[PDB]
């Protein structure tokens, strides 16, 4: 259940920048009744405050639904389930759609090969490198 | 995997599915080859129904495809009744902007009110207005 946020990427960089709604750092994930109960940390007023969310299962495997900053269609992917986890969030807020990609590792960092693939996959969709934030190299919660 | 009709279109940006919109295309058929989806659509251009052939390539994930059209697209297929209808959700990336276009296909020009109702409510439940849904089963199109 132990996880670390290693890379964040978004169509809207502000979503993952400081004070951003999706700049959350995963701590652990526990599966209950097929749902994903996530415990995250987020920074506010200088301190690390807990954030508990639940991504509910859907009729589709690896697809979940999450109510946060609007609604989100969440997709899980991983070729190495015990080494990393990739979660793609399609966020709908005020009629606006954005994609937020999360790369989780068992420890604070991940192999360059895994990070490179995640990053190139994001950029190949038509996004700039600047919209990728590798936080393994940052002092966060 | 064969004969289809576009019954309902819905999008985060209505201009995308309105007249002259890049996603206002009417499916005619889908042929599966090497796991890829070869689609044949019709599009209205200058009072003329012009053919549009596209291929959605398979990915490492089932029911997920990649399509190069009006930028890039992550395409997801869903259906509780595969022989009755097909739902395709397009996550379009155009000039750094993301939009969602949902397509509801039927074996014939129209679909049950139940199926259309669920499709439409699922769309609106995500935070979109009813006006962004276009039921084209009630309009003369290609
Ligand atoms: C990062 C994916 C996720 C979101 C919410 C949640 O509760 C658990 C996992
Ligand atoms: C509407 C889904 C679809 C897109 C492209 C394609 O080639 C086949 C099906
Ligand atoms: Cl660790
Ligand atoms: Cl630790
Ligand atoms: Cl626009
Ligand atoms: Cl028919
Ligand atoms: Cl027909
Ligand atoms: Zn750790
Ligand atoms: Zn527009
Ligand atoms: Zn027909």
UniProtKB/Swiss-Prot annotation, chain A:
It comes from the Eukaryota. Glycans are attached at residues 28, 109. It is found in: Secreted. The keyword Oxidoreductase does not apply. GO terms for molecular function: small molecule binding. Milk. Disulfide bonds join 48-141. GO terms for cellular component: extracellular space. Keywords: Disulfide bond, Glycoprotein, Milk protein, Secreted, Signal, Transport. The keyword Transport applies. Homodimer. Belongs to the calycin superfamily. Lipocalin family. This is Trichosurin. The chain holds residues 40 to 180 of 180 of the full protein.
Curated annotation (Swiss-Prot), chain B:
It comes from the Eukaryota. Disulfide bonds join 49-142. Keywords: Disulfide bond, Glycoprotein, Milk protein, Secreted, Signal, Transport. GO terms for cellular component: extracellular space. Glycans are attached at residues 29, 110. It is found in: Secreted. Coiled coil: none annotated. Its main location: secreted. Milk. GO terms for molecular function: small molecule binding. Belongs to the calycin superfamily. Lipocalin family. Homodimer. This is Trichosurin. It comes from Trichosurus vulpecula.
């Amino acid at each position: 259940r132990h996880w670390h946020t290693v890379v964040l990427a978004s169509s809207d960089r502000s979503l993952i920048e400081e004070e951003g709604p999706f700049r959350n750092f995963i701590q652990n994930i526990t599966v209950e009744s097929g749902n994903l109960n996530g415990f995250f940390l987020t920074r506010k007023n200088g301190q690390c405050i807990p954030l508990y969310l639940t991504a509910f299962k859907t009729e589709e495997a690896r697809q979940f639904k999450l109510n946060y900053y609007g609604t989100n269609d969440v997709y899980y992917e991983s070729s190495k389930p015990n080494e990393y986890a990739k979660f793609i969030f399609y966020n709908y807020h005020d009629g606006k759609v954005n994609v937020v990609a999360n790369l989780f590792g068992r420890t604070p960092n991940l192999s360059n090969e895994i990070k490179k693939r995640f990053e190139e996959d994001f950029m190949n969709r038509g996004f700039r490198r600047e919209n990728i934030l590798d936080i393994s190299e940052v002092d966060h919660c």
